[PDB]
């Protein structure tokens, strides 16, 4: 029993974190095989950051202008190239701790674990979701740039996020591991703002199913709803439209609990209209939307507390 914001064990990623320094600018890199991946922002100084031309800044660099440190060992850079907003630094040593890995670009509403890192040293791990507006509500300070987000499946680390910047609202923006930003953001210190965000409806429903699995049914009701009638209510509360694909993805959780997906939607509609009445669900007074249906199946018992 119980239900926590649960991150993946971070050890396979900790073994890949290095420090990349160009001049006085330092950040984190990801050392996989003989390549170190880091944000291209490492080649800027404070006077370059409002509108850097990275192609022009990079051609002025040599391999020996990049200092890469893994713990206390220094890694020699023998080649470099820019791909989108990441640098790929070829080093003379393959990382012996390289896990089985993939690079994945996730959809909004998906979750991942973040290994917050400073000066190449992991400091903490927490769970995040990619918001519908393609920001994440992380916890990052200066020096965190290059920290990575990931999921793990059968000892394969799927890297999906590399951290770059903080927006004026205190939320965070970054790239996939090929250097493509999530959302419309660019890696320069300009007026940028996260677009209006919405609540991840399919995740809220998955979390309601988790509450039922763990033994709580107070929020259910005897009603049902059509998918269209639900979305007209969801839209007025700034919830994402629920699609038939979302309904199918909630299939396994609906089967385990005996609660039809559209019946849980009727429960959610009532929670949105009535509030919680000073009650909690899985220890939260708000509707939680950063657990995917996969996250619930991974953590919850396969046996419902009936």
């Amino acid at each position: 029993s119980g239900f926590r914001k649960m991150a993946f064990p971070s050890g396979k990623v900790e073994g890949c974190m290095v420090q990349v320094t160009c001049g006085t600018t330092t950040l984190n890199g990801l050392w996989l095989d003989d390549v170190v991946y880091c944000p291209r922002a490492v080649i800027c100084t404070s006077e370059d950051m409002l509108n850097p031309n990275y192609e022009d800044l990079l051609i002025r660099k040599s391999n020996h202008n990049f200092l890469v440190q893994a713990g206390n060992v220094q890694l020699r850079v023998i080649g470099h190239s820019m791909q989108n907003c990441v640098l790929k630094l070829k080093v003379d040593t393959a990382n012996p701790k390289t896990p089985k890995y993939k690079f994945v670009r996730i959809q909004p509403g998906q979750t991942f674990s973040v290994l917050a890192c400073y000066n190449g040293s992991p400091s903490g791990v927490y769970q995040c979701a990619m918001r519908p507006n393609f920001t994440i509500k992380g916890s990052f300070l200066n020096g965190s740039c290059g920290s990575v987000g990931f999921n793990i499946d059968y000892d394969c680390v799927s890297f999906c996020y590399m951290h770059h910047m903080e927006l004026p609202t205190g939320v965070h923006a970054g790239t996939d591991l090929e250097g493509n930003f999530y959302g419309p953001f660019v890696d320069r210190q300009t007026a940028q703002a996260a677009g209006t965000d919405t609540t991840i409806t399919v995740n809220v429903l998955a979390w309601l199913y988790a509450a039922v699995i763990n033994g709580d049914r107070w929020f259910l009701n005897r009603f049902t709803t059509t998918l269209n009638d639900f979305n007209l209510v969801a839209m007025k509360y700034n919830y994402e439209p629920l699609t038939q694909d979302h309904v199918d993805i909630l299939g396994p959780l609906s089967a385990q609990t005996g609660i039809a997906v559209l019946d849980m939607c009727a429960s959610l509609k009532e929670l949105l209209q009535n509030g919680m009445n000073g009650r909690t669900i899985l220890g939260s007074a708000l509707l939680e939307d950063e657990f995917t249906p996969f996250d619930v199946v991974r953590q919850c018992s396969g046996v419902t507390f009936q």
């Binding site: 320094t21 006085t24 600018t25 330092t26 950040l27 944000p39 922002a41 490492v42 800027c44 950051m49 409002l50 400073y118 000066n119 990052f140 300070l141 200066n142 020096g143 965190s144 740039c145 951290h163 770059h164 910047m165 903080e166 927006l167 004026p168 923006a173 953001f185 890696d187 320069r188 210190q189 300009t190 007026a191 940028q192």
Partner: peptide, 10 residues
């Protein structure tokens, strides 16, 4: 305000 590239100083 402006976005902030959260690099570190060394």
């Amino acid at each position: 305000t402006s976005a902030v590239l959260q690099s570190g100083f060394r």
